[PDB]
Design an enzyme around this catalytic site. Structure first.
Site, PDB file in Angstrom:
ATOM      1  CE1 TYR A  38      -3.931  -2.159   0.364  1.00  0.00           C
ATOM      2  CE2 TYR A  38      -2.776  -3.193   2.199  1.00  0.00           C
ATOM      3  CZ  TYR A  38      -3.816  -3.187   1.292  1.00  0.00           C
ATOM      4  OH  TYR A  38      -4.726  -4.216   1.292  1.00  0.00           O
ATOM      5  CG  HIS A  40      -2.670  -1.582  -4.297  1.00  0.00           C
ATOM      6  ND1 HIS A  40      -2.746  -2.269  -3.102  1.00  0.00           N
ATOM      7  CD2 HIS A  40      -3.866  -1.757  -4.905  1.00  0.00           C
ATOM      8  CE1 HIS A  40      -3.934  -2.834  -2.997  1.00  0.00           C
ATOM      9  NE2 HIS A  40      -4.633  -2.539  -4.075  1.00  0.00           N
ATOM     10  CD  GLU A  58      -7.422  -1.078  -2.831  1.00  0.00           C
ATOM     11  OE1 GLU A  58      -7.353  -1.394  -1.622  1.00  0.00           O
ATOM     12  OE2 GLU A  58      -7.573  -1.900  -3.740  1.00  0.00           O
ATOM     13  NE  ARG A  77      -7.720  -2.119   1.695  1.00  0.00           N
ATOM     14  CZ  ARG A  77      -7.888  -2.924   2.743  1.00  0.00           C
ATOM     15  NH1 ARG A  77      -8.181  -2.428   3.937  1.00  0.00           N
ATOM     16  NH2 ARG A  77      -7.854  -4.240   2.572  1.00  0.00           N
ATOM     17  CG  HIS A  92     -12.541  -5.933   1.614  1.00  0.00           C
ATOM     18  ND1 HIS A  92     -12.703  -6.072   0.250  1.00  0.00           N
ATOM     19  CD2 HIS A  92     -11.223  -5.715   1.816  1.00  0.00           C
ATOM     20  CE1 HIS A  92     -11.529  -5.949  -0.343  1.00  0.00           C
ATOM     21  NE2 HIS A  92     -10.614  -5.730   0.581  1.00  0.00           N
ATOM     22  CG  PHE A 100     -13.735  -2.574  -1.915  1.00  0.00           C
ATOM     23  CD1 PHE A 100     -13.335  -2.344  -0.609  1.00  0.00           C
ATOM     24  CD2 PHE A 100     -12.781  -2.963  -2.850  1.00  0.00           C
ATOM     25  CE1 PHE A 100     -12.013  -2.488  -0.238  1.00  0.00           C
ATOM     26  CE2 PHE A 100     -11.454  -3.109  -2.486  1.00  0.00           C
ATOM     27  CZ  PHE A 100     -11.072  -2.873  -1.179  1.00  0.00           C
TER      28      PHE A 100
END
Ligand code: 2GP
Ligand code: CA
Length: 104
Positions: A38, A40, A58, A77, A92, A100
């Protein structure tokens, strides 16, 4: 009240700004953290109607209130773009598999 609610996690705009700034700084320097690297690219497979232009990235936002530094990223996120504009907050939680849904 929560500015963003991801499942049972409650976030204020300050929580989001703080996480976003950390993720954007890493993106700008070309560095990543954690096993999933992250921040990414967020491909938007979901097709969310973000009002800001791609590309999107994210970066985990944590319910502990700490900035992500590695280890489990949890389910939430913050999505930002090349210009450090918040596109949205997703999770999630409540979505099947690795999909998501937007935090309300
Ligand atoms: N569901 C979803 N996952 C994405 C998207 N873009 C990148 N991913 C990543 O693609 C992989 C398969 O879904 C996962 O590693 C997920 O990462 P995160 O767990 O970090 O979100 C996207 O648009 N939607
Ligand atoms: Ca639900």
């Amino acid at each position: 009240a929560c500015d963003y609610t991801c499942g049972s996690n409650c976030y204020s705009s300050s929580d989001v700004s703080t996480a976003q700034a950390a993720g954007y700084k890493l993106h700008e320097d070309g560095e990543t953290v954690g096993s999933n690297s992250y921040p990414h690219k967020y491909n938007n497979y979901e097709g969310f109607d973000f009002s800001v232009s791609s590309p999107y990235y994210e970066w985990p936002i944590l319910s502990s209130g700490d900035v992500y530094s590695g280890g489990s990223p949890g389910a939430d996120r913050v999505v930002f773009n090349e210009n450090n504009q918040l596109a949205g907050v997703i999770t999630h939680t409540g979505a099947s598999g690795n999909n998501f849904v937007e935090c309300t």
